[PDB]
Design an enzyme around this catalytic site. Structure first.
Site, mmCIF file in Angstrom:
data_model
loop_
_atom_site.group_PDB
_atom_site.id
_atom_site.type_symbol
_atom_site.label_atom_id
_atom_site.label_comp_id
_atom_site.label_asym_id
_atom_site.label_seq_id
_atom_site.Cartn_x
_atom_site.Cartn_y
_atom_site.Cartn_z
ATOM 1 N N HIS A 101 0.821 -1.218 0.000
ATOM 2 C CA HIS A 101 0.000 0.000 0.000
ATOM 3 C C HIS A 101 0.856 1.270 0.000
ATOM 4 O O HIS A 101 0.471 2.299 0.565
ATOM 5 C CB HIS A 101 -0.957 0.036 1.180
ATOM 6 C CG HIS A 101 -1.976 -1.055 1.166
ATOM 7 N ND1 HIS A 101 -3.235 -0.887 0.633
ATOM 8 C CD2 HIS A 101 -1.937 -2.319 1.656
ATOM 9 C CE1 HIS A 101 -3.921 -2.008 0.778
ATOM 10 N NE2 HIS A 101 -3.155 -2.890 1.395
ATOM 11 N N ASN A 174 -9.946 -3.051 2.970
ATOM 12 C CA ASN A 174 -9.779 -2.950 1.514
ATOM 13 C C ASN A 174 -11.138 -2.712 0.856
ATOM 14 O O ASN A 174 -12.165 -2.620 1.526
ATOM 15 C CB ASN A 174 -9.117 -4.207 0.931
ATOM 16 C CG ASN A 174 -7.633 -4.321 1.279
ATOM 17 O OD1 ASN A 174 -6.968 -3.325 1.548
ATOM 18 N ND2 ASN A 174 -7.111 -5.547 1.265
ATOM 19 N N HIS A 365 -3.024 0.767 11.975
ATOM 20 C CA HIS A 365 -2.699 -0.591 12.371
ATOM 21 C C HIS A 365 -3.956 -1.219 12.958
ATOM 22 O O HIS A 365 -4.537 -0.650 13.887
ATOM 23 C CB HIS A 365 -1.543 -0.601 13.385
ATOM 24 C CG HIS A 365 -1.248 -1.954 13.942
ATOM 25 N ND1 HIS A 365 -0.544 -2.910 13.236
ATOM 26 C CD2 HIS A 365 -1.594 -2.525 15.119
ATOM 27 C CE1 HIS A 365 -0.465 -4.012 13.964
ATOM 28 N NE2 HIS A 365 -1.091 -3.803 15.111
HETATM 29 C C1 HDD Z 1 1.052 -10.166 8.377
HETATM 30 C C2 HDD Z 1 1.163 -9.245 7.430
HETATM 31 C C3 HDD Z 1 -0.039 -8.596 6.859
HETATM 32 C C4 HDD Z 1 -1.233 -9.201 6.464
HETATM 33 C C5 HDD Z 1 -1.641 -10.647 6.527
HETATM 34 C C6 HDD Z 1 -2.029 -8.050 5.994
HETATM 35 N N1 HDD Z 1 -1.389 -6.869 6.048
HETATM 36 FE FE1 HDD Z 1 -1.981 -4.943 5.582
HETATM 37 N N2 HDD Z 1 -0.250 -4.196 5.982
HETATM 38 C C7 HDD Z 1 0.782 -4.861 6.529
HETATM 39 C C8 HDD Z 1 0.810 -6.171 6.829
HETATM 40 C C9 HDD Z 1 -0.187 -7.153 6.588
HETATM 41 C C10 HDD Z 1 1.997 -3.958 6.788
HETATM 42 C C11 HDD Z 1 3.220 -4.487 6.049
HETATM 43 O O1 HDD Z 1 2.282 -3.901 8.192
HETATM 44 C C12 HDD Z 1 1.545 -2.597 6.319
HETATM 45 C C13 HDD Z 1 2.547 -1.968 5.344
HETATM 46 C C14 HDD Z 1 2.987 -0.630 5.910
HETATM 47 C C15 HDD Z 1 2.238 -0.568 7.205
HETATM 48 O O2 HDD Z 1 2.325 0.367 7.997
HETATM 49 O O3 HDD Z 1 1.476 -1.667 7.409
HETATM 50 C C16 HDD Z 1 0.144 -2.873 5.757
HETATM 51 C C17 HDD Z 1 -0.595 -1.913 5.161
HETATM 52 C C18 HDD Z 1 -2.006 -1.957 4.892
HETATM 53 C C19 HDD Z 1 -2.848 -0.795 4.487
HETATM 54 C C20 HDD Z 1 -2.471 0.631 4.229
HETATM 55 C C21 HDD Z 1 -2.621 1.520 5.470
HETATM 56 C C22 HDD Z 1 -2.136 2.901 5.128
HETATM 57 O O4 HDD Z 1 -2.849 3.573 4.360
HETATM 58 O O5 HDD Z 1 -1.028 3.278 5.572
HETATM 59 C C23 HDD Z 1 -4.088 -1.319 4.351
HETATM 60 C C24 HDD Z 1 -5.328 -0.572 3.946
HETATM 61 C C25 HDD Z 1 -3.984 -2.749 4.688
HETATM 62 N N3 HDD Z 1 -2.723 -3.103 4.982
HETATM 63 C C26 HDD Z 1 -5.057 -3.643 4.717
HETATM 64 C C27 HDD Z 1 -5.005 -5.109 4.867
HETATM 65 C C28 HDD Z 1 -6.156 -5.935 4.681
HETATM 66 C C29 HDD Z 1 -7.558 -5.509 4.345
HETATM 67 C C30 HDD Z 1 -5.666 -7.213 4.891
HETATM 68 C C31 HDD Z 1 -6.385 -8.511 4.833
HETATM 69 C C32 HDD Z 1 -7.462 -8.710 5.564
HETATM 70 C C33 HDD Z 1 -4.236 -7.047 5.206
HETATM 71 N N4 HDD Z 1 -3.871 -5.761 5.154
HETATM 72 C C34 HDD Z 1 -3.337 -8.164 5.487
#
Ligand code: HDD
Ligand code: HDD
Lengths: 726, 726
Positions: A101, A174, A365
C-alpha cells in the site's frame, strides 16, 4: 516582489470546481473547516508569509543563491554551514516506503453515529448520536511503489483512523470483502509473488506476470479475491465510488460482557462505479495521479466524499450456522443472509497541508482497537497484529511514531515508557515503573467497566494442542468464487473473462495459463471455456465433466456483489468534456452549463489550443485544456455544442476524443451540426441508445444526457465497439 | 515436484531473442559471462536447488503454510519464532529510495581503452589497451520515484562504476551536456520545484506543473537544459540510443604533473534515437517498465549495449579563450570547436542476479576519483562532492556502505577506520591509529608518483576573498539555448515547440506561461511565436524587438547537437510487429523472418488471441502476444503479410494497430491483400514514402523496409498525421 500584481497567483479560499483555481494546502484553501484533530495540529503548523528565511537554527540567511567560495570563481569552503545544512536536510529527505500500500492518498474528516449502540458495544465513539469523532482516511493501491500509478488493476486499501475519546481506533480494510490468503504466515509469499519479480523488478503495479499466476495456480484459496480483482472492482472510477470492508470477523462487547460477531462495511454515498480496462490502463499513462487528483479536487469543490458505516451482526450462538467458517477471510458473508445495518456516516471535508508530514508518515494498524471491540482467532488477522507495530520501527524511525503529529491521539495518554529515537515528550513523573510509591502509583490502572474503563480481552474459550495446522473448515475454495460470478451482470461477466484473458496472455510460461484455466473449470465451465478460447486452449473432456461447487446456504446469486445490478449511480461530482469551436453557439452552451450546474456536474471546456475563443454572441470562453491535454479518459461524458463545426470537423484529436469515449462506453451528446460526428463513430442516421442528439441543446437534450450519466456507462453499446478502431 | 515434466519452466542458458524464454537472473542465464567483479561476488551468491528451507539461523522448517496456534482454529502463539522471523524480515524490506534518480536500471560489463593515455593522465585504467576494467552501469530518470514509469519526459542519468586497480572511479553523468543550475546551493530549490508539489504530491514523473515553470521563469540559467528536456532528447527510444556526458570540466593529471581540462562523453554504438511525445506518454501506461525491460532482454539476446568513451581536451592555457566559462555547467563545449577524441569502449553484457541487492543498493558518487584525475572549481561539481557521501548514511544505513558487495572495490583497501553499523570487515591490526609504532605504522602512506602512487591534489592557485557570489562570467543565459535550437532539424524544432506547448498548457496560473514565453523570446522569436500561438498568447511589439543573442565563438549551429541531422541509425536490436491472420501465406513469413534475422532485427507474431495459428502450408505459428497486449508503442515497425486478410480486416484492434504506428511515424509494410489496410491510414492507391508495399514480401520488399528502419522514423509523414484520428 515576484507575485503578479493582479494577485492571480493565490487561489480563493472558498469551494471552487476542479480546474478553476490552483489547488492549495487545506488550511489555506478552507481555513474555517475544523475539527478537534485539525485544531490540535495547529501547534506544529508553520507559516511563511512575512517571515525571514533562516537556517534550522534560526539564523537569517542573506544570500540563498550561492555557496561560500574563495573568490567568486574559486573552491567551495567547508565552513559554509548554511550550504551544508540545506544540502544535508535535502540529502536525507526520504524515508522507507510502506511494504504494501505504498501508493496512497489521504484526507481529513469526521464521523458520527446515527444512534447509540450501547446495547451491542460499549465503544465510546458509538455510544451517543451527538458524539463527533475526527477521522483521517488513506486510500491506497497494494502492489505499486509510492511513485506508481493510480488507475492500475489492483485491490484498493481503505484505512480510517478514528480519534476517539477512549483511544485511537484504526479500521484497516480494503475495497473487497475477502483477502487472497488464509494464514498470515503466507503473506510474504503471496506479496512476493504479486510484487515485481526479484531478478529485474518488473512489472510495476500489475499482477499480469508469471509469479503471481504461478502462486494462484498452486493456492486455490486465492481464487475468490482473484475473481474480484479481475472484475471491474479492481479498477474503480474513484475512491468515492468503491465499497470498503474490514474483511475479518471482529467482536463487539457490550457493558454486560456480551460478545457479538461483527464485520465492517463502508457504503459509498456516490454509488459504485468502475472504469473499463483499456481506459484504466491508458489512464495510468495519461494521468498516473488521477485518483489522487480527483479526491483532492472533489474536497476543494465541496463534493465531500461520504460513506455510511455498516455492520453485519452475528450472535455468538450462530457461529457455525453457515457453510463457510466465520473466521475464514477468504469467505464473505452474503448480505442476503446477514444484512448490513446502518451505523453512522463519515464525511471527508479537508485536504492535508503537507503530503509527506500527514499522509506518508501516518501509521494505521488494525491492532489499534478500543474497549467495546475485540479480535477473533481469524488466522490472518492474528498475524496482522504483529506486523503493523513491527514495521514502523524502520519506516518511521523508531518506537515514538505515535508522537508524530498526525498519529497523536486527541485523548490523554500517560504511561511508564521512556526514551527512544526522537523522543518528544518530556516526562516529569518521578517514577518510570509501577507499582511505585514515589508517585503514589500514578498513572494508575483502570478496572473494566461500562464506560471509561480499562481494556480487558473477551474471555473466550481455548482448547487444542499446539499445532501448525489449517482448520479443515477452511478447505473449500470454489463456492464463493462461483457465487460472485453468478451475481454479476452479463457485461460484468464479459469484463471478468477479459481480465483473466488479458492477464494470462502476459504469463510467459504456458503451463501456468493451463493450470489457472483448470482452476476456473472448478468454478464455472462457462467462465473457463471463455477464457480458454482467448488463450487458444481447449478443455479436456474430463475438465468439461468437473462437478460445480455447491451453493452457499441455498444462494445461487446475491445482487449486492455486483457493481451495477442494482442502480445506485449519482451524477454529483462527475465531469463532462465540452468540445469547443471558434464560433460556438452560445444558446447551446447556456443550456448545457445550466443543466449540469443543477445536478452538480462539472465541465471542462476543451479546444485545440489554450487561451480563449469567442462565441457567436461575443461571449469570451476560457479554455481549460487541449483535446490531447485532457483526454476523454478523464471525463464521464462528452458534449459537442453547435457553432462552426468545420473548425474541428477534420481535427484528428477532436474525432479521436469521441472515438475513445465511445469505445469506453461513455455517453455522448451532439447538438445541431455536431451530429456530423456520428460518422466517426459509425452511428447510422437513425441514431442509437447512448448518443443524445437534437437540433439544439434546449429541451430534453440535457435530461437524456444526465439520465445516461446516472447509469454511468452505456453497456448496450458493447457489441458495437469491436469494429471501432480506437 | 511442481515443475512441468517437460522442463519448460526453466529458460535455456544461452542467448535467446526477446520474448522467446522467461527472463532469468544473470548468473543462471549466462553462467559463462565473467569479469573480475562478477567473479568476486561469488562469495555472497546464494543458490536454492536441493537445499532445505530454513530460518535465517539455519533451522529447517517443516510447515511453511501455517502459524502455530492453540488448536487448529485457535489463537496464534507468541512462541512461533518461525512466523515472527519471516514476518519481521518482510516488515523491514524497504530502504529509503534515492532522493533523485530513484528510478533506474543497471547492468554489469567491462571497459577497455584503445591505446595508452599516459601522455595526458596517469590513471591506471587508461594506461594499457590490454587492461580490462569491470564496470557496473545504472541508467535512470530523475524526478520520479522507484516505482514511476520509464518513458517519461525527463533528463536521464548515466552512471558508471569503474572497478580499477587503483580505486573505484564513478563517472556520474546525464544524457545531456549541461545541467539546469550553476551553483549546488540551489539544487534543493530546483529539485523541490520539479518534484511533486508538497501539498498533494502531484505530479509523478513530470515537469508539466506550475512550480517547475515558476522556477524556470525566474531562473533563466535553467533555459539551456530545459530546451534539451523539451526536445526529443527528453524521451529516449532506449538507454542504448542516448548519449552520456559528465557535464563538468574535470582535469587529467599526467606523471609530469601537467593538468589538462577534460569533459567526458559516451557515444552510443546503436546511434541516437528518441520516441515522440504521444508515443512516450502512452507507453508509460501500456508498459511503465519499457526501458528496464528492453535493457534486460537486449543483454539476454547477446545484443550488448556498447558505448565509446571520448574526451574533449583543452590545454590549461586555453581556459579563457571561449565566449563562455569552462567551469559553468549550464554551458556546453561545441564539438565543432573542441572535438570528442575517442578513448575506449564499454560493453554491457550481464544482467544482475537480484535487483534489490545489486541495483537498489549500488552507490555512485562523482567524488570517487583516482590518481590521474582531479576536480575543478565548477560550483555545481563542488557541492556534489558533499552530497553523494552524506546521503548514503540514511539511504544505505551507515558508513560501511562500501562493504555492501556491489560497492566493494576489487583492489586492496586498508585504513584505520573502524566500527559503524553492520561492520563486516574484522580488523586484526594491533593499531587503529597512525602514526603508530606497534604495527610499524602499517598500513602506510604512499608518495605520489607515475604509477601506484598516492593521491595528491593539483596545486592550483587560489586568490580571492571569501564571498557568496556568482562569477560574472556565468551571467549569460541565451546563447547556448539558441545554438541548440538552431542545430535541430525542422521536425525536431517542431517537437520542441510542442513540448513547451504541451507542458505550459498544464500550468494552471497563466502568468507563469506568459513569463516563460517572454524568456523564449530572448532565445528565438520563431520558437517564442510558435509556442505563444498554441497558448493563445500574443507577443507584444517590445518582445518582437528583443535582440537575438550572439552565437558561440562564431558558431551559429552545430549538427552534433541534433539527434538526426547526421545519420547514425543501426537496426540491430530493433523489433518488428508482424500481424497474423488465421491462414498466413507461409512464403511471405519465411522471407520476412529470414531478412530480419540477417540484420539482427527481432519480431513478435501478434494475433487476436493466444495460442497458435496454421499457415497456408500447414506450418504451426506460435503467437507471442495479442494486438492489445503488445501495442504498436513497443515496436519499431509493422509488417502485415498476405493471407486470409478478411480474418482481421474488420478487427478494430488490428486497424488501430496500424493507425497508432502510422501517427507515430513508424515504417509500415503491406504484402498482397494486406494492402487493403491502406484505406485505414488514408494512403492513396499510388502509395507514399514510408509505406512499403508489393504483391509479395519478396524482392526488394524487405530491403525497403529495413532501409526505413535505419532512418528510425518517417519524418516526412508529419504533415499527414494531424488529420488522422488516432
Ligand atoms: C502479516 C502481514 C499482513 C497481512 C496478513 C495483511 N497486512 Fe496490511 N499491511 C501490513 C501487513 C499485513 C503492513 C506491512 O504492516 C503494512 C505496510 C505498511 C504498514 O504500515 O502496514 C500494511 C498496510 C495496509 C494498508 C495501508 C494503510 C495505510 O494507508 O497506511 C491497508 C489498507 C492494509 N494493509 C489492509 C489489509 C487488509 C484488508 C488485509 C487482509 C485482511 C491485510 N492488510 C493483510
Ligand atoms: C548537491 C546536490 C547534487 C547536485 C548539484 C547534483 N546531484 Fe546527482 N545526485 C545527488 C545530488 C546532487 C544525490 C542526492 O547525492 C544522489 C541521489 C542519491 C545518491 O546516491 O546520489 C544523486 C544521484 C545522481 C545519479 C544517479 C546515480 C545512481 O544511478 O545511483 C546520477 C546519474 C546523477 N546524480 C547525476 C548528476 C549530474 C549529471 C549532475 C549535474 C551535473 C548532478 N547529479 C547534480
Amino acid at each position: 516582489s515576484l507575485a503578479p500584481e493582479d494577485g492571480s497567483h493565490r487561489p480563493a479560499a472558498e469551494p471552487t470546481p476542479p480546474g478553476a483555481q490552483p489547488t492549495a494546502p487545506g488550511s489555506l484553501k478552507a481555513p474555517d473547516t475544523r475539527n478537534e484533530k485539525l485544531n490540535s495540529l495547529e501547534d506544529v503548523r508553520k507559516g511563511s508569509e512575512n517571515y525571514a528565511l533562516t537556517t534550522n537554527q534560526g539564523v537569517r540567511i542573506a544570500d540563498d543563491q550561492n555557496s561560500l567560495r574563495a573568490g567568486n570563481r574559486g573552491p567551495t569552503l567547508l565552513e559554509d554551514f548554511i550550504l551544508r545544512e540545506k544540502i544535508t536536510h535535502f540529502d536525507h529527505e526520504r524515508i522507507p516506503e510502506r511494504i504494501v500500500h505504498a501508493r496512497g492518498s489521504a484526507a481529513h474528516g469526521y464521523f458520527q453515529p446515527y444512534k447509540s449502540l450501547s446495547d451491542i458495544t460499549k465503544a465510546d465513539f458509538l455510544s451517543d448520536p451527538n458524539k463527533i469523532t475526527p477521522v483521517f482516511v488513506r486510500f491506497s493501491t497494494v502492489q505499486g511503489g509510492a511513485g506508481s500509478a493510480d488507475t492500475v488493476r489492483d485491490i484498493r486499501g481503505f484505512a480510517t483512523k478514528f480519534y476517539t475519546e477512549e483511544g485511537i481506533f484504526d479500521l484497516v480494510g480494503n475495497n473487497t470483502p475477502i483477502f487472497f490468503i488464509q494464514d498470515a504466515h503466507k503473506f510474504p509469499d503471496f506479496v512476493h509473488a504479486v510484487k515485481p519479480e526479484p531478478h529485474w523488478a518488473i512489472p510495476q503495479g500489475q499482477s499480469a506476470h508469471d509469479t503471481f499466476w504461478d502462486y494462484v495456480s498452486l493456492q486455490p484459496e486465492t481464487l475468490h479475491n482473484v475473481m474480484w480483482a479481475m472484475s471491474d472492482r479492481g479498477i474503480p472510477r474513484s475512491y468515492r465510488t468503491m465499497e470498503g470492508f474490514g474483511i475479518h470477523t471482529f467482536r463487539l462487547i457490550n457493558a454486560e460482557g456480551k460478545a457479538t460477531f461483527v464485520r465492517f462495511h463502508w457504503k459509498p454515498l456516490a454509488g459504485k462505479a468502475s472504469l473499463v480496462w483499456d481506459e484504466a490502463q491508458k489512464l495510468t499513462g495519461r494521468d498516473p495521479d488521477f485518483h489522487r487528483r480527483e479526491l483532492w479536487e472533489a474536497i476543494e469543490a465541496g463534493d465531500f466524499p461520504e460513506y455510511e458505516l455498516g455492520f453485519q451482526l452475528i450472535p455468538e450462538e450462530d457461529e457455525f450456522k453457515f457453510d463457510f467458517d466465520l473466521l475464514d477471510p477468504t469467505k464473505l458473508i452474503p448480505e442476503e443472509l446477514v444484512p448490513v445495518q446502518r451505523v453512522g456516516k463519515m464525511v471527508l471535508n479537508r485536504n492535508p497541508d503537507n503530503f509527506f508530514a500527514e499522509n506518508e508518515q501516518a501509521a494505521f494498524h488494525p491492532g489499534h482497537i478500543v474497549p467495546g471491540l475485540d479480535f477473533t482467532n481469524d488466522p490472518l488477522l492474528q498475524g496482522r497484529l504483529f506486523s503493523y507495530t513491527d514495521t514502523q520501527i524502520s519506516r518511521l524511525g523508531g518506537p515514538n511514531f505515535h508522537e508524530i503529529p498526525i498519529n497523536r491521539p486527541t485523548c490523554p495518554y500517560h504511561n511508564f515508557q521512556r526514551d527512544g529515537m526522537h523522543r518528544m515528550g518530556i516526562d516529569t513523573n518521578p517514577a518510570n515503573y509501577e507499582p511505585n510509591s514515589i508517585n503514589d502509583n500514578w498513572p494508575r490502572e483502570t478496572p473494566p467497566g461500562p464506560k471509561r474503563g480499562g481494556f480487558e480481552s473477551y474471555q473466550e474459550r481455548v482448547e487444542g494442542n499446539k499445532v501448525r495446522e489449517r482448520s479443515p473448515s477452511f478447505g473449500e475454495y470454489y463456492s464463493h468464487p462461483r457465487l460472485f460470478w453468478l451475481s454479476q451482470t452479463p457485461f460484468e461477466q464479459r469484463h471478468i473473462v477479459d481480465g483473466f484473458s488479458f492477464e494470462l496472455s502476459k504469463v510467459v510460461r504456458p503451463y501456468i495459463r493451463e493450470r489457472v484455466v483448470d482452476q476456473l473449470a472448478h468454478i464455472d465451465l462457462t467462465l473457463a471455456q471463455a477464457v480458454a478460447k482467448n488463450l487458444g486452449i481447449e478443455l479436456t473432456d474430463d475438465q468439461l465433466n468437473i462437478t460445480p461447487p455447491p451453493d452457499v446456504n441455498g444462494l445461487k446469486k446475491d445482487p449486492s456483489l455486483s457493481l451495477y445490478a442494482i442502480p445506485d449511480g449519482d451524477v454529483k461530482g462527475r465531469v463532462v468534456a465540452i468540445l469547443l469551436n471558434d464560433e460556438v453557439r452560445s444558446a447551446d452552451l447556456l443550456a448545457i452549463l445550466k443543466a449540469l450546474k443543477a445536478k452538480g456536474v462539472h465541465a471542462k471546456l476543451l479546444y485545440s489550443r489554450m487561451g480563449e475563443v469567442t462565441a457567436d454572441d461575443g461571449t469570451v470562453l476560457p479554455i481549460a485544456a487541449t483535446f490531447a491535454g485532457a483526454p476523454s479518459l478523464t471525463v464521464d461524458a462528452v458534449i459537442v455544442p453547435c457553432g462552426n463545426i468545420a473548425d474541428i470537423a477534420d481535427n484528428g484529436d477532436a474525432n479521436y476524443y469521441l472515438m475513445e469515449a465511445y469505445k469506453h462506453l461513455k455517453p455522448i451528446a451532439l447538438a445541431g451540426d455536431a451530429r456530423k460526428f456520428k460518422a466517426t463513430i459509425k452511428i447510422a442516421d437513425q441514431g442509437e441508445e447512448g448518443i443524445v442528439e437534437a437540433d439544439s441543446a434546449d429541451g430534453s437534450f440535457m435530461d437524456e444526457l444526465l439520465t445516461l450519466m446516472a447509469a454511468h456507462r452505456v453497456w448496450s453499446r458493447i457489441p458495437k465497439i469491436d469494429k471501432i478502431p480506437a
